[PDB]
Amino acid sequence: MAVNVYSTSVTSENLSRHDMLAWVNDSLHLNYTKIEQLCSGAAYCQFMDMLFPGCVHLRKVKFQAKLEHEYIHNFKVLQAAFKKMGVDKIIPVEKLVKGKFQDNFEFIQWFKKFFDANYDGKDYNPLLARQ
Amino acid sequence: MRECISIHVGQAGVQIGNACWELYCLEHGIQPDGQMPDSFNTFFSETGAGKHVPRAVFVDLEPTVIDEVRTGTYRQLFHPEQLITGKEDAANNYARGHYTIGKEIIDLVLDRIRKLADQCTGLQGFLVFHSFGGGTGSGFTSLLMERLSVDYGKKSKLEFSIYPAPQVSTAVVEPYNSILTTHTTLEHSDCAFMVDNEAIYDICRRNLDIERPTYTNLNRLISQIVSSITASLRFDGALNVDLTEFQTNLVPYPRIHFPLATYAPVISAEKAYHEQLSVAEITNACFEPANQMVKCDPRHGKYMACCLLYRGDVVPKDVNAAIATIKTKRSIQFVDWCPTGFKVGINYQPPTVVPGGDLAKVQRAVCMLSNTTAIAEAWARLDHKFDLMYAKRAFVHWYVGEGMEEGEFSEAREDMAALEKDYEEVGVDSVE
Amino acid sequence: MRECISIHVGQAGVQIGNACWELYCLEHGIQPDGQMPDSFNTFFSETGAGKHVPRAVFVDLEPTVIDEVRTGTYRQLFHPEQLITGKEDAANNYARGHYTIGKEIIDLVLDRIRKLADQCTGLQGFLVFHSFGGGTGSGFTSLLMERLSVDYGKKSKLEFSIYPAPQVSTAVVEPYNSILTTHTTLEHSDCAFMVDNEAIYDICRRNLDIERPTYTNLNRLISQIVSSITASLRFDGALNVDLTEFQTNLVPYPRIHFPLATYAPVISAEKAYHEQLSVAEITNACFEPANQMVKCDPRHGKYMACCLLYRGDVVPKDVNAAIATIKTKRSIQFVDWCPTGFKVGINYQPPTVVPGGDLAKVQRAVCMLSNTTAIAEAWARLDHKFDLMYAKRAFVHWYVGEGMEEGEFSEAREDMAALEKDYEEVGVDSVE
Amino acid sequence: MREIVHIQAGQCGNQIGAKFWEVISDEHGIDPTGSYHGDSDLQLERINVYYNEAAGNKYVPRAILVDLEPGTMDSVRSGPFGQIFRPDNFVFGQSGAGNNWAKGHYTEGAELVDSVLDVVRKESESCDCLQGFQLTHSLGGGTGSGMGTLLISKIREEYPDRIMNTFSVVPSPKVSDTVVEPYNATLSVHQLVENTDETYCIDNEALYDICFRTLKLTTPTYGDLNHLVSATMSGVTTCLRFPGQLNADLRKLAVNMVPFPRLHFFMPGFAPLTSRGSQQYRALTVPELTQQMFDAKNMMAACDPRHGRYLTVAAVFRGRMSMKEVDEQMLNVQNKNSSYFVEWIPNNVKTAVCDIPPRGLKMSATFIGNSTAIQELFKRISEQFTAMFRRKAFLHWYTGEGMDEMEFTEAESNMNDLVSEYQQYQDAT
Amino acid sequence: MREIVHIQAGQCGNQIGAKFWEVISDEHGIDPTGSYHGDSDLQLERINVYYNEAAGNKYVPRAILVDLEPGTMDSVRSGPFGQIFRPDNFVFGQSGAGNNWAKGHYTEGAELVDSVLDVVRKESESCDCLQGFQLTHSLGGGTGSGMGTLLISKIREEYPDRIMNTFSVVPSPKVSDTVVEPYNATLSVHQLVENTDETYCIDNEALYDICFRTLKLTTPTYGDLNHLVSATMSGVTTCLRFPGQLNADLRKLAVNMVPFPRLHFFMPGFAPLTSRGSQQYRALTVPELTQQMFDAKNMMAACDPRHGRYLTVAAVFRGRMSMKEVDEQMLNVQNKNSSYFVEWIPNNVKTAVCDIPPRGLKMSATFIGNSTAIQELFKRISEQFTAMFRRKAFLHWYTGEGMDEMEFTEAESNMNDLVSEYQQYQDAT
Ligand SMILES: Nc1nc2c(ncn2[C@@H]2O[C@H](COP(=O)(O)OP(=O)(O)OP(=O)(O)O)[C@@H](O)[C@H]2O)c(=O)[nH]1
Ligand SMILES: Nc1nc2c(ncn2[C@@H]2O[C@H](COP(=O)(O)OP(=O)(O)OP(=O)(O)O)[C@@H](O)[C@H]2O)c(=O)[nH]1
Ligand SMILES: [Mg+2]
Ligand SMILES: [Mg+2]
């Protein structure tokens, strides 16, 4: 069971670009320098695994994706996981995969809220998940 | 050159046939007398005079339904020898259809098929119209298919089949008939298109604003789907698909040969304006579950193959664009063993409209043929229905009285169990 | 390109919508049948033929009000699917609107919005028309907004809302409905424009010399304000403002998103002559308290933001001059944390006049959107009203009977207390 | 004098072919009847490269039209220019291939192949000095792919000393036009690697992009796409058909463009492309053309040249232009974009200039790039093939026609090896 | 020979830009179609400074039009001279910026910036010797301010050796055109101080005053205001575009006018301005022009030069006039108004003379003043910023786009430092 969250208009509930990227880096043990690198979908897939044990078939996720269709494939995996958990937010896949900053930043801000709602404090070694 | 022979079995098959041949005549400008003041030629043979005759056989075990054809508007269209009737029907009994009553006319039917086929120079194959539920549609059809398979080894055979509803049935023995005929026909059919009366009724009510749709309406709708499938053969096009391609594309495993048909747009005269009806719009309509013609939930299943047949004022680029966006969407999931899911056909001829029809005239239409693991649900339901009745041997005496053996029931059921198991296995994604 | 989708909820929303769409058609030269013999296009989509269709949805839980649209003058203007009606209304009960009755059509409404939005290439956002007092206007609207927020993350949403009067009410449960809907919608709306029937009536009586103004008149007046707000998108201009700018300018703190609309000049045919109606003159008229459309006293409050939208034969320099002098005047005080108070828009198109309308034809008009701490007074009044009834649990059984919990009442009330406190805090000037 | 034989297989192959013929005919001043109505001796000088001269002063394309189904053929016959073709050069079956490479290569195609071969041989014997062959087709279907490859195999066996060129329509990246296309492509590529001397890779996805983004065509038709391809095709033989300053031909280009036998898969490009409105706002000069040629958006294969290195580039210019300028431009691109060119093939730009420009334009350019980026395309196909083959999906359609798993496996392995080879040279120093 | 790239960002930027182009075109004898219909060899001599020559003897502005919304662009296209522009040089978004610097600089603007940059690079490569760039925009909005600054940042990084000039519309003193303008201005100034070589400060308040008081226009339109700005702009490049007696250019002026890198904010002025009736009652001679130039009422920035000191003044004269006279006038102003000129920069008036006067006039003058009085403007903005920021008013609109308080704070501090610097030099001996 997974709750649902909305982002429209708030105050003192928004991480800076820098802070948010730091959080992603610490959480997943990666070295992204631009928020748009999250458009590959691998990071989101990994986060789902960390939140909800099981959930995603990580052997299918391409962690070094460089082509639009590869990114699309990762997001299909993500979409399936959202369906399984009953999260009803529509992911704007077509906009995300173009690697546009605005859309990616929007999605990460939602995802952070979603993560915070549902994270139980568990520790795991994400390197094994990756490879 | 590329002839297609149509066979209409029993009440459903015959009445759908009436609706199809009415449409064909309007599309090719053939009058009800066979006169017109190379396209039509795949469906109509030509005599010495300007008369044209359907490449068709109509068969039923009772005379009533075909007698309507004989006395009706298109009496002069068909040759008497292509309208075949017995005396007594199969009485909703597969056994009577397959054995007792059917064995008396099977030879006749096949003989007429042979004569038809002899005057074909490039026979593509057969279009077979029937129902799952009737004794003729189930028992006779199965028998007929078996004979066809032997007499004509490897030619494309396509079955348009009235699949019974979940909760809107007519006959009581429908499940028995459905199960047995599916068992017996399985190894003899290449691809079979299920369609459900409940779903079409819903469409009529919801999309066409018809309070009380009649069987006629359903038939008309079916005729559209058929026309889409055969338009690539009956007209010129930009990108074309023939009967032997569908089987290749839509059938991933030999037993899993049950795709489903969906048509768009189905709209009324007043609702036809107010909205431009683009390729994107109709394509989206296709994959929305409410417009499907089988009462099943694709959202709960996976796609294994989609074939999209567009017709009329259609632009390839636009279609490509439309498909790409649909590929993204969460509600469309495809099996993991299928990176390419789409075969696409585009034909220049817009859907032609029957005078006094329920559908509005559109510049573009599309017919989707999609194979989905969601069909497993229906099969499971039907098997359950069989189980309930068979556990008590309800109605079994009739079947055995007509020469069927009880062991054959169990055989049919186990085969269907296997089929169910096969779908489920297919469903699962690849490890590593 | 820059599409705007309009949603009309319940009786008020629908009837205001009728008045808006009548005006839009006259402004763009669109006939009641959708025909005209890139500007209009932000509000009207276009079919293959010369027909144009409003980018709008009309929703009500009972059929009566929408049935008028269906049978009325603009029956051919709207597509049937954009006029949505249930069977039974919310009976002035927020609960029925939000839960019991509303949950049956919410999916439908949203589906139609999605279809509308799909045919937009540059969706700017949503214009939502409703009332605070009705069960549909309160309960359904709140529900709808919530869904919109989730489905469409960050797109501008603007609510034109019929705020209840101090001493000129219709329903008895109005305060309950107002309070709950404000609580539930607060975090989901970006900016909400209050307007009061009492004030408009007064304006009609005092400025237009109308003995007995009807709801129609009020609706017409409202349509002017809306037209001013959207003219920058529907026409060319000198200095332009779009929907996403208003929210930035008029909203200093997330919760404090209630500006108020004022229009000038509102004059009759005989009173239209005798006076030249300059920019200075109309601007002064705007900031005089008697011409305001909420029954409140700005002289007793502070301005936090003013947006002035001028239209027609207007000269930027003149506007600047006018504003400067208003800045001086004692009766206009602004909060100390806001040295810049004005956003100014100037558009070339004069206000277009509805045949048989109450307003005279003018060369220039102006619509002021102003955010004022004086609105706190109204909130305080409404809270007091809630308190009086709730202390006795008057009418509460109805709400609970429809599945609402008593705890939610207290929750709504405390949230409103906080809001009141927030306004007051904002009011005070900076130390040091 | 250097006569070329044209072959068209399947729907795609035939539709491109017709377009190409329409282009060539206009260029050489030939009408839909076969009569010369041109206004220059240059139009007839090398007419024999593509046309046979028949009795009564008419010209007939040295073209063979092949399909397992008769509809496309009929359409071509009924088209504008349909009457110019030799009636006996249309060789068609009745059955079709059902989108199946097996049917095209082993079954239906095999029943028809001898009839094609007979025509081909006759055409060859017509010619005083046969230059070679150009085959137009798709890799994704059954006829163009399976039967086309069969034709290539047989023709090559018969005429191993003549050059075999293909214009192959490749499956696109994002959307699949057919479900079995990975099988069909994979098999076809296996044949092409061993039996063709050069292969021009063309992808509809790229073409659509060009139409929408560059040509500003809201509503492209397949005709438009075909036109582009035809323009490229005509570009490659322009130096053979008219006089020039520095004359290239098919052999020379192959020699320059192919440093190792297996690496003969090109990505073509054409310049200049402009909208109706945007044409007057520019100046068509050599540098402009060059710049248009060297970018990713103007490649007709769906791969970014910036994801690999160019092994070689051939640039063919048509029109009256200064050779010095061209040379300068060529040097400039190499110098400035050094990282996109393999360092162990110095001066890896080959230039040709033909004095006769195409009709309507004062100058134009055709680009042939042999880039290691094409490996991406192959890789994708391999992936798609694997995903399907591992579950034996659709396999009974092919095994039913006599094919075995072993053949599939070998084909896959060969494809993989090719990819590896391409990878190797991009990283080599 | 010294080619200049023009960029226009947002509504204001584009509307000024169009006006400027209309001015330049008339000056060089170019019609709305791009054709030369002038009557002098001097009009074409240096045409390449602002125009690219396209095919068929037409000229196209080296202009890029940028906006996050498509309405202003459309208007420009539909305007008189709209058809002269390169269609592919209009680079527009769909969303708009909502008067938000953040959206222009980090979000919407960032999604569009690469497309702009691509055009820019191409334009640069067109030119034989790129002189530099001029950007027209406001500081108070979202596009011109946020996206404009982003463009400046990127272009400067790419081309650090070319000069970056801005014509910036600054927020007025008495009345505010938008509510968040202090934020937008403050942020923009932070970028401008680090990334521009010279910045012309123009204020609508000043312009209106000039229109009403000097030009005697009861009812000015924005067009009129724009015209003045365009006249100034044309004035600064006049010596680069025509022959003269003592030739200046953009580099020289920057060198003379900027004694320290941060102090590059000018106040422009133009002479002669006259009414319709009042023109005949005067004589346009050098002294008259000079006197018109040196007063507070003719400055296009809302600050009194008498409240500070001039660090430097550049005066650019157009027309046939005696250099001696000009020199005398320049000396005279320095001598008589000694207290308004900083004493540690001797002879701090720089003179340029271009022989070609503007159309309709026999002589004219353009004034560029670098005055310590501009600190007033900055101070006001700082005050306004502080008043709002101390209560965190509107901050969630910017923080919502990923911005942090720290960025704001740093921007404020930098602005304050600049003010301090300016103060320092006014008091220095
Ligand atoms: N769509 C459609 N379905 C029909 C029509 N007529 C009958 N059916 C369906 O067909 C099934 C009944 O089978 P029939 O075809 O009437 O029976 P039969 O094949 O004639 O067999 P017997 O009469 O028992 O010899 C039921 O599911 C009916 O709903 C029709 O005109 N259209
Ligand atoms: N300005 C204006 N206000 C209206 C109009 N009609 C109703 N109202 C106001 O709206 C409030 C009543 O709400 P309604 O909109 O009628 O109720 P509803 O939204 O239909 O909700 P239910 O009928 O309870 O389902 C009162 O304050 C009325 O004065 C109108 O045409 N114009
Ligand atoms: Mg019957
Ligand atoms: Mg109501």
| SS (HEC) of C317-371 | HHHHHHHHHHHHCCCCCECCCCCCCEEEEEECCCCCCCCCCCCCCCCEEEEEEEE
| Residues near A125 by beta carbon (within 8 Å), at least 6 away in sequence | none
CA atoms of B79 and C248, how far apart (whole Å): 78
Among residues C374, C396, C418, the one where a domain terminates is C374
Of the partner residues A8, A88, A90, the one whose CB lies closest to the CB of residue C187: A8
**C39: chain E residues, CB-CB within 8 Å:** none
Residue of C99, C131, C294 best suited for mutating to test ligand 2, as the one with most atoms within 8 Å of CB = C131
Could you tell me whether strands B303-312 and B364-372 are parallel, antiparallel, or unpaired per DSSP bridges? antiparallel
Choose, from C146, C198, C245, C281, the residue flagged as catalytic.
C245
Reference D168, options D23, D318, D377, D423; nearest CA is D377
Q: Are residues B51 and B190 in the same domain?
A: yes
**A72: chain D residues, CB-CB within 8 Å:** 174
**D176: chain B residues, CB-CB within 8 Å:** 339-342
Single-letter code of the amino acid located at B76: Q
CA distances to B325, B327, C237, D164 from E222, in Å:
45, 50, 11, 69
Which tokens in the block code for residue B329? 């969407």
| Residues near D295 by beta carbon (within 8 Å), at least 6 away in sequence | none
Reference D284, options D315, D237, D319, D334; nearest CA is D319
* Gap from CA of C19 to ligand 2 centroid (Å): 14
Coil, strand or helix at C274: coil
Of the partner residues B275, B280, B284, the one whose CB lies closest to the CB of residue C47: B275
Closest residue on chain B to A60 (Cα)? B432
Q: Are residues C220 and C188 in the same domain?
A: yes
Q: E1-259: CATH homologous superfamily?
A: Tubulin/FtsZ, GTPase domain (3.40.50.1440)
**Is the CB of E389 inside 8 Å of chain A's CB atoms?**
no
Q: Please judge whether C337 and E387 are an interchain contact, meaning their C-beta atoms are less than 8 angstroms apart.
A: yes
Which tokens in the block code for residue B394? 């309800």
Coil, strand or helix at C9: strand
Q: Please judge whether A100 and E106 are an interchain contact, meaning their C-beta atoms are less than 8 angstroms apart.
A: no
If 0-12 CB within 10 Å is exposed, 13-18 middle and 19+ buried, where does residue E332 land? middle
* Residue appearing with tokens 């069977």: C87
Q: Are residues C2 and C108 in the same domain?
A: yes
**DSSP code, position E80:** T
Q: Is the CB of C363 under 6 A from ligand 2?
A: no
Choose, from B245, B408, B411, B420, the residue flagged as catalytic.
B245
Q: How far is C5 from chain B (nearest CA, A)?
A: 16
Q: Are residues C24 and C96 in the same domain?
A: yes
Cross-strand bridge partners of residue B84: B59
Reference B257, options B320, B201, B185; nearest CA is B185
Residues of B annotated in the binding site for Mg(2+), as ranges? Answer: 62
The answer to whether the Cα torsion of B179, B183, B185, B189 is positive or negative is positive
User: Where along chain D do its domains lie?
Assistant: 1-259, 260-373, 374-429
CA distances to B33, E66, E127, E135, E256 from E131, in Å:
84, 21, 9, 14, 17
Report phi then psi at E91, rounded to 5.
-120, 105
Q: Are residues B395 and B405 in the same domain?
A: yes
**A92: chain E residues, CB-CB within 8 Å:** none
**E83: chain D residues, CB-CB within 8 Å:** none
**DSSP code, position E372:** G
Q: Are residues C186 and C278 in the same domain?
A: no
CA atoms of D13 and D221, how far apart (whole Å): 16
Reference C282, options C309, C301, C303, C242; nearest CA is C309
Which residue range is the domain that position B264 belongs to?
260-374
Q: Are residues B242 and B183 in the same domain?
A: yes
Q: Please judge whether B236 and D71 are an interchain contact, meaning their C-beta atoms are less than 8 angstroms apart.
A: yes
Q: Are residues B213 and B298 in the same domain?
A: no
* Gap from CA of C12 to ligand 2 centroid (Å): 4
Q: Is the CB of C192 under 6 A from ligand 2?
A: no
Cβ(D83)–Cβ(D32) below 8 Å: yes
CA atoms of B244 and D187, how far apart (whole Å): 20
Q: Are residues C3 and C121 in the same domain?
A: yes
Strand boundaries in B123-266, DSSP class E: 125-131, 156-162, 191-195, 237-239, 260-264
Longest C-alpha distance within chain D, in Å?
62
Angle between the E148-158 and E108-126 helix axes, to the nearest 10 degrees?
Answer: 40
Contacts 24+ apart (CB under 8 A), A90-93: A90/B330, A90/C151, A91/B330, A93/B328, A93/B329
| b/e burial code for range D354-367 (CB count within 10 A of at least 16 → b) | bbbbbeeeebbbbb
| b/e burial code for range B289-320 (CB count within 10 A of at least 16 → b) | eebbbbbbebeebbbbbbbbbbbbebbbbbbb
Cβ(D72)–Cβ(D137) below 8 Å: no
For chains D and E, CB pairs below 8 A equal: 24
**Is residue E298 part of an annotated ligand binding site?**
no
Cβ(B339)–Cβ(D384) below 8 Å: yes
* Gap from CA of C138 to ligand 2 centroid (Å): 10
Which tokens in the block code for residue D63? 């073209």
Reference E103, options E4, E37, E183; nearest CA is E183
* Residue appearing with tokens 């329903």: C171
Q: Please judge whether D100 and B248 are an interchain contact, meaning their C-beta atoms are less than 8 angstroms apart.
A: yes
CA atoms of C211 and D69, how far apart (whole Å): 83
| b/e burial code for range D104-140 (CB count within 10 A of at least 16 → b) | bbbbbbeebbeebbebbeebbeebeebbbbbbbbbbb
CA atoms of D316 and D286, how far apart (whole Å): 12
* Gap from CA of B15 to ligand 3 centroid (Å): 11
Q: Are residues B277 and B402 in the same domain?
A: no
Q: Are residues B104 and B239 in the same domain?
A: yes
**DSSP code, position B207:** H
If 0-12 CB within 10 Å is exposed, 13-18 middle and 19+ buried, where does residue D279 land? middle
Coil, strand or helix at C123: coil
Coil, strand or helix at C194: strand
Count up the domains in chain B and report the number: 3
Q: Are residues C12 and C34 in the same domain?
A: yes
Domain D374-429 carries which CATH code?
A: 1.10.287.600
Q: What share of chain A is helix, strand, coil (3-state, %, to 5)?
A: 60, 0, 40
Q: Please judge whether A6 and C154 are an interchain contact, meaning their C-beta atoms are less than 8 angstroms apart.
A: no
Q: Cα angle at C384 between C378 and C388, to 5 degrees?
A: 150
**Looking at ligand 1, which atom is closest to the CA of residue B91?**
24
Q: Please judge whether A59 and B431 are an interchain contact, meaning their C-beta atoms are less than 8 angstroms apart.
A: yes
Residues of B annotated in the binding site, as ranges? Answer: 10-12, 15, 62, 90, 131, 134-137, 170, 174, 197, 215, 219, 243
Reference C330, options C303, C291, C364, C290; nearest CA is C303
Q: Please judge whether A57 and B429 are an interchain contact, meaning their C-beta atoms are less than 8 angstroms apart.
A: yes
Q: E260-373: CATH homologous superfamily?
A: Tubulin/FtsZ, C-terminal domain (3.30.1330.20)
If 0-12 CB within 10 Å is exposed, 13-18 middle and 19+ buried, where does residue A47 land? buried
Residues with CB under 5 A from ligand 3 (ion): B 11, 89
Cβ(B347)–Cβ(B231) below 8 Å: yes
Q: How far is A7 from chain C (nearest CA, A)?
A: 6
* Helix locations, B83-196, DSSP H: 94-95, 106-118, 135, 141-151, 174-185
Which tokens in the block code for residue E308? 């500070």
Closest residue on chain A to C154 (Cα)? A8
Cis link prior to B265 (omega < 30° from 0)? yes
Q: How far is B89 from chain A (nearest CA, A)?
A: 50
Q: Please judge whether C150 and A6 are an interchain contact, meaning their C-beta atoms are less than 8 angstroms apart.
A: yes
Reference E253, options E339, E312, E317, E213; nearest CA is E312
Cross-strand bridge partners of residue E6: E63, E134
CA atoms of E96 and E73, how far apart (whole Å): 12
**E56: chain D residues, CB-CB within 8 Å:** 280
Give one DSSP letter per residue of D394-422, joined into a string. Answer: THHHHHTTT--HHHHHHHHHHHHHHHHHH
Cross-strand bridge partners of residue B305: B371
CA distances to B166, D216, E116 from D213, in Å:
50, 5, 16
Q: Is C245 a catalytic residue?
A: yes
**Is residue E138 part of an annotated ligand binding site?**
yes
